[PDB]
Design an enzyme around this catalytic site. Sequence first.
Site, PDB file in Angstrom:
ATOM      1  N   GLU A  46       0.845  -1.184   0.000  1.00 48.34           N
ATOM      2  CA  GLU A  46       0.000   0.000   0.000  1.00 48.34           C
ATOM      3  C   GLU A  46       0.886   1.241   0.000  1.00 48.34           C
ATOM      4  OE1 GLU A  46      -1.973  -0.083   3.839  1.00 48.34           O
ATOM      5  OE2 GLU A  46      -0.333   1.116   4.691  1.00 48.34           O
ATOM      6  N   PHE A  49      -0.799   6.429  -2.556  1.00 51.08           N
ATOM      7  CA  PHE A  49      -1.244   6.252  -3.952  1.00 51.08           C
ATOM      8  C   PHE A  49      -2.449   5.301  -4.077  1.00 51.08           C
ATOM      9  CE2 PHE A  49      -0.013   1.901  -4.535  1.00 51.08           C
ATOM     10  CZ  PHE A  49       1.138   1.683  -3.745  1.00 51.08           C
ATOM     11  N   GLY A  50      -2.524   4.328  -3.172  1.00 52.38           N
ATOM     12  CA  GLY A  50      -3.603   3.336  -3.202  1.00 52.38           C
ATOM     13  C   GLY A  50      -3.072   2.007  -2.735  1.00 52.38           C
ATOM     14  N   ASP A 203      12.637   8.828  -6.772  1.00 52.91           N
ATOM     15  CA  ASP A 203      11.948   8.394  -5.576  1.00 52.91           C
ATOM     16  C   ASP A 203      12.362   6.971  -5.230  1.00 52.91           C
ATOM     17  OD1 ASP A 203      10.071   8.652  -3.438  1.00 52.91           O
ATOM     18  OD2 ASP A 203       8.451   7.897  -4.698  1.00 52.91           O
ATOM     19  N   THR A 243       6.089   7.029  -9.996  1.00 49.86           N
ATOM     20  CA  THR A 243       5.222   8.140  -9.652  1.00 49.86           C
ATOM     21  C   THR A 243       5.898   9.528  -9.743  1.00 49.86           C
ATOM     22  OG1 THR A 243       4.133   6.598  -8.127  1.00 49.86           O
ATOM     23  CG2 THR A 243       3.462   8.918  -7.984  1.00 49.86           C
TER      24      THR A 243
END
Length: 351
Positions: A46, A49-50, A203, A243
Amino acid sequence: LGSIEISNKKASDAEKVYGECSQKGPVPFSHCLPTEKLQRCEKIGEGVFGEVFQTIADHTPVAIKIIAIEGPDLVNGSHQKTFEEILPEIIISKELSLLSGEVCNRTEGFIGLNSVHCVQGSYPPLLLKAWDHYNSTKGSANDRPDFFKDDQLFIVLEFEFGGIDLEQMRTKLSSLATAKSILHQLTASLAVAEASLRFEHRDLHWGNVLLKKTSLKKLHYTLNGKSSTIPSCGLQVSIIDYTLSRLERDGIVVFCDVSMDEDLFTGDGDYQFDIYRLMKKENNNRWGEYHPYSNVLWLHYLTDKMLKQMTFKTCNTPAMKQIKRKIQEFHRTMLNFSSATDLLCQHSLFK
């Protein structure tokens, strides 16, 4: 009057996500996730972001990343991404998957993508069950995704399953020799992506480095026409989660414009949050720019993790002492290189 121009832009932004998904319009969840697939889901990860579920497609484990888009509800404290903000990860997840099958610049160090769809509906009750299990056993920092109405749009990216992230592998890495492998694999992937795509990850925190057991002695990559090998020490590293990434496709820059973000640049309690700050300072808050040094910064953050936060099952031997000494010299010198490509090709760690 601007109403017309705005919705025509939505729009537009919608028409590019289809058919980067090769859709003409949202499909149901069951198009991506028929019952049998859905029946095999178990929530594996998780973030804000979801949600990430593992299942099986064609006799093979896959990771499905589900991101609610375009709706007005805050999800996990944050706004949902628009058609326009979700596009980069889509495009980039695509370009980086193709690297494994390219010629001149080739790597299997990024996650393979099977497909990406824009899906419409409430959360599959079977997913909510899977969401519930994980919450009972690992604990979730997320809202329970049970409030989506049936017009709700999601991006579902179906990835190969890359194994388990470096954080979770914190205490399962056997030796310093393995740390060097992982670091070697990361540098080479980034270097191949720099050469093909002018890519920066931006990231690369340790949850974004996945490790799978391999029976291979040597992993292979191709950088600017030259193939070379890396001793596996029994793991294949996959880099995931694009992302925040940036690359160019033909000669079009694709990236996450964070030039107006502030929460990203004010984190604490981890070296991870200094990298965001260093990147911004180094690129002057211009995020479309190419600054491969950013990959080196993330590699430096990753090297710090290896030295400071890994607890190995095997010191040990004069042999590993030495390797330790080398990662430490690596740590102290790597910032004096211009790119993962500079590092790969020039650093004594990789000779």
